[PDB]
Write a protein that binds this ligand. Sequence first.
Ligand SMILES: [Ca+2]
Length: 223
Amino acid sequence: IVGGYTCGANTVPYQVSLNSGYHFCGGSLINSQWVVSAAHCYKSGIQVRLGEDNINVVEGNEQFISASKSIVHPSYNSNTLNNDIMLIKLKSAASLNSRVASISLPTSCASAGTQCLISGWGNTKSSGTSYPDVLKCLKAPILSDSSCKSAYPGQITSNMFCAGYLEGGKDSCQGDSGGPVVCSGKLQGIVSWGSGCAQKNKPGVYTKVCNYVSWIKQTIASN
Ligand SMILES: [Ca+2]
């Protein structure tokens, strides 16, 4: 997260870190056994880390649970990043509490102008590299489809939306991939892509979760 703020320990209780020997992506806990992330975060050997703040220090509220399976969206295209969504099942159910809690799926799509919370452990610099170890947060508005398509000609599908600031300076970044965009207590987006980070006229692009609720519910119900 570039141009954000330190969230505060366990203030984003649905935020997970995906770890394969190291943090590589964010995710969102949507029930005791399932995490939603980006399809481009797919790999084998995933451990889901819940209750994290400092991802380099065991602080006492963590739960570490290996994934038993991952399910990449059937229509995910890794070239275009269309349908950039994946489900991860935990080998055992997380113990839910105030610091480890699921986030609700949307019942309707969020509109341009809606204020959201984006979070992650990704790079905090738009030029160069610095990784925070504590969770970072950014409040950002959903942008109009028109402005999104104008910013990224030929690249924005019906399964994507832009959020952030056209002036630059505030954005998600490398390592935030797969993490949450939450608006009015609903998971509306997944950190997907962008051209660099926090660059002028290049806002963050996010997977439009409301398009996938039926797929998510049905997949969970049979797996
Ligand atoms: Ca920790």
